[PDB]
Amino acid sequence: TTALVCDNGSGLVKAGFAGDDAPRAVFPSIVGRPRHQGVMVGMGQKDSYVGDEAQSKRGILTLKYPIEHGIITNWDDMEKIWHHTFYNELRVAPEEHPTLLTEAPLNPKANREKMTQIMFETFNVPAMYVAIQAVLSLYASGRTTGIVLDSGDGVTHNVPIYEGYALPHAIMRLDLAGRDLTDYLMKILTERGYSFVTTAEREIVRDIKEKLCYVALDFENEMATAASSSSLEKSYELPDGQVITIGNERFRCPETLFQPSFIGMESAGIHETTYNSIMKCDIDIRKDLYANNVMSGGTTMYPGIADRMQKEITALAPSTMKIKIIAPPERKYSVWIGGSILASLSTFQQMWITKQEYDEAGPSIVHRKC
Amino acid sequence: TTALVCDNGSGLVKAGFAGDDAPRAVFPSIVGRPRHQGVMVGMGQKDSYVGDEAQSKRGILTLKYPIEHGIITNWDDMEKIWHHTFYNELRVAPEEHPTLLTEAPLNPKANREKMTQIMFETFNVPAMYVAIQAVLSLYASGRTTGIVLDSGDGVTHNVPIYEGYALPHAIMRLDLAGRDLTDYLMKILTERGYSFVTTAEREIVRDIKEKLCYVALDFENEMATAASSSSLEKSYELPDGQVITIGNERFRCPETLFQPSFIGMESAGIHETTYNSIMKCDIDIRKDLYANNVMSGGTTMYPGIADRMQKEITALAPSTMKIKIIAPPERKYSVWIGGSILASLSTFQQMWITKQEYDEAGPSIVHRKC
Amino acid sequence: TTALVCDNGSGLVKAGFAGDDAPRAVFPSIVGRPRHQGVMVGMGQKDSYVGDEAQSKRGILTLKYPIEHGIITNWDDMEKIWHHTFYNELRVAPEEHPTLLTEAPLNPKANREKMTQIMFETFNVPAMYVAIQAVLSLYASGRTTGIVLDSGDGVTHNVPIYEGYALPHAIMRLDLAGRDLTDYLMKILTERGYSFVTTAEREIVRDIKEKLCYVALDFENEMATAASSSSLEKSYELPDGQVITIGNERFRCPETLFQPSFIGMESAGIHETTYNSIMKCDIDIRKDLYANNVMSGGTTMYPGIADRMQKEITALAPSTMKIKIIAPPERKYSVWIGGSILASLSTFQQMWITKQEYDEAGPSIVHRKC
Amino acid sequence: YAFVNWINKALENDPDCRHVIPMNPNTDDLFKAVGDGIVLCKMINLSVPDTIDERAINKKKLTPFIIQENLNLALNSASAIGCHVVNIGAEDLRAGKPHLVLGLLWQIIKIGLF
Ligand SMILES: Nc1ncnc2c1ncn2[C@@H]1O[C@H](COP(=O)(O)OP(=O)(O)O)[C@@H](O)[C@H]1O
Ligand SMILES: Nc1ncnc2c1ncn2[C@@H]1O[C@H](COP(=O)(O)OP(=O)(O)O)[C@@H](O)[C@H]1O
Ligand SMILES: Nc1ncnc2c1ncn2[C@@H]1O[C@H](COP(=O)(O)OP(=O)(O)O)[C@@H](O)[C@H]1O
Ligand SMILES: [Mg+2]
Ligand SMILES: [Mg+2]
């Protein structure tokens, strides 16, 4: 039947069907739990908040991310979210629809085996496939050659693909996609008399970052502009009724991606990460890697990220041959779009992990079929 | 001639000189203002009260704390308090003696610049410096390495230090030191029939907490002892001529420090805050941070808290190496003692905020020098 | 004056007198730099750490390896490295003591020239000499005929020597000794729910490799044993307090030396390199080469490297005559011991590179004097 | 203990160093104060006493918590003789190491005598 393309992650959940161009089930991967005391009978019966029922009542609920930087630590909540997105969101039965699940590279074997065992035992899916998000994002761009920079909520890796073939030794995983940026904004908001310690304000702060923060071209020029003038002061309306205005902490937050020293990280920025990935590939394939920079994920939605990283790569290049930057509009769903495109192909039907072969092999068949 | 150190805390104010070991000007940070009607001519001459005259005449006077969790919400009152301290308490000339001021980390920039401007233009001092209260608490219990469990009147911030290296990303500030405990005690005192609405009654409740409240070891065993027996019953004599009897609320009040959910906060306790701050630190520095917890501030002198968070850390530890916590007898005044100790430094003399440099730099010289 | 012998290496650098049987310089060759903020006065006053001074503080510092497979890129840190090696472990004056230098073969003339000038200009050396590590390591075994496999931390070269004569056309170089092994181990350690990205854990990973990793005899049999049984599971105690346990990634790391496909390079393994070197020699001298395989360097001390190498060469042998693998206990210091023995000879005093001859010769004096 | 006497006889070029290193009574005052670099500023008194005074650069305003100000202040004056061990910084010399102290004393001996 129609395969289910479910892109589970630490942030939003992208669940849909195979062959479609946009997912249907979109909701953050947040589990809310009651924390107040129920004084009136009839409303304390519900304690399972997975979808939008937790976002609306975030002030009386405890929003927690059971996935931590592409690592599933709370499988009990993942089972609840999976059941929700399979019953109420997609409104389909996984028992006859294969579910396409994605997994970040350099992932532990326990995380890969548990997500397989749960589907074969609890959901008893007839078959599924586990694919890398970076590989799937390449099909969304229509290309088969070029490094793909993937960045979601807490995972940022660089998997260069040359003529379909990928280089496992050219893969490094950086745990800075969206969560550390949110934490940095959380910390730097306290310099303006703002207090942000509760988990209910995390969604509001993330929205403020998404609608106000932007990747700056020159950091020192932005510092000079903010210190001298105040032309980049944008105000925000808090849901409770308060009014805030931030002009300096707007472009400082996205600069942590290029300068991880703000959050105390020994790893380099994303601009040098792609260059380092290219350096460890072949010298005869660097032409196809400089001219193919396809980013994916919702992280690179800032107004000016592509120009900034192009300038960084040009500065990091010996100025010998040109650099080309690909920023498709469907970057937040490029992983899901690529998964749907691949699952809709005719050659993809014969490597799904069917139930009989999984039972005869075991949980380790996911490491051999994927 | 000599440097001045004025510890501006949320509940108590400590002031003195450079090189001293015991503060001289110690008085609560309270502002007394008349609110009744005076029928006798000659007694209603003073407009506001700063020193202990408001404390002794609290029956016809109110109490107003201008600092609210490390933030000076009332600067007119602190100008009066600073003038009183420099005139009647210290009895020195501020224009000829540098003053050292205290400020908690994660503080707003405008607040920090106000202790700069109000001192430079009003008092016209030669030079000052703005230090960190965590660093000052790390000036009175001698050791180059150790995280400080600073907890004053309304600020509880934990800064990890390894050989001296401070980690700004590892600073966890909590706005629950002494005021939340006092409010908890007042609201739990109403169950037995003791209402406390008047702000002038705050000092009596604070003294009751200081002399009766203590941190227990296990909360469930304390519940069992209080419900079954009545051995932990102590009486207090009110100044107006009445006696109380509290036996269950003695140890419940300090329990809010480790379980802030009693008053309705989503943050963790002081025993877990240090652990989380250590977890986000490095891997080869935790050995010198597990057995090092600087305990100080106006909050942490309860008889039974040191062993309490020692046991909490040991339980939260993988049981690898030892945990030991120093509790210097001068806990409350460790901030002022550390301020004077810092003022007694050698290279500290040429890096005060120079008036000539400040005038050509501006209000932002505090963030550049400090 | 007593001659000095210094053995430089990517991981460990050795120094000492000529004639001594025991080494003196035992320290990792690493460079660290301050990266944290000092809130207390008097700190941050260092340009670059070198060696154990960074090893003892590997939590708040980075790690830099200026030696990249015997290639000297940044000479500013190499000045510090040589200053560490000489004065801290000799205490004699090189200005009036001859020093014997070591250098990897197939080294571009620029590196040798610059290390010569540095000795003749930064120092005031009366007579120096530069020798190949493989040639010097032959004197440690007491032989003058046979190949020597010198494998340090990033250098792996095979220089066959027959009756003192060496074959320039049979000399190759492989950049896989200990560094790519460490990278492979820290990459594969992430499959067991571990995180290894920063260099602060690099020394711990190297220690775990040195005390756990071992060259396996049969890799497929080891896979079968690890998958079926759980007997080869040894635990490590992390310095901070956590406990790790690795059973499969132990013998996988040393297998990269024989199977270069793990790191993705087209070059052959260490077992085929010596066979190819022998094949490049004469057919009448292979008898002295098969029975003389002296091991040296920091790599070839795995528990089971000698037997595996013997089996690999026997599989490559035409089944005509015996293969002998020499693995002296002092494989870490074979180069230094051989250099000390050679410099102790009376003949070796008459070809040191004197300063007076260098003054009229020029920078290329090492090229025909060594 | 003989090393103390050797260092005394070698460094009597500047007798003011004997207020840091042991003055022939074989004590162990050398390591901590030399790690602070006090001898480097003292060594100039070889020819002329009119230079950085021992009580002028440091009179122990190193407060009972932070004693971190003297080491960098005195080690920055190492322009004389020259610490040819540029590997070491004042960070590690805060406590001192045997090999590092020996390496720095190597330069002290070498340049201290003309
Ligand atoms: N317009 C925007 N501006 C800035 N950041 C954005 C914008 N839209 C999305 N983001 C960031 O992109 C991230 C998307 O993460 P996501 O891919 O959902 O993680 P996961 O794949 O783990 O679910 C979010 O954390 C969000 O902070
Ligand atoms: N002996 C004590 N026992 C319990 N609480 C105390 C004691 N002494 C002071 N406190 C609390 O400390 C608070 C004042 O702290 P403060 O001295 O202002 O801290 P800091 O000196 O760090 O500014 C008061 O609210 C009071 O409740
Ligand atoms: N006992 C051991 N077993 C396995 N590997 C080791 C052992 N000792 C050192 N190594 C590795 O070898 C490297 C050190 O090489 P080095 O001592 O610099 O070689 P050389 O002696 O040729 O200079 C380091 O990566 C270290 O991990
Ligand atoms: Mg994603
Ligand atoms: Mg204080």
Ligand SMILES: [Mg+2]
């Ligand atoms: Mg070597």
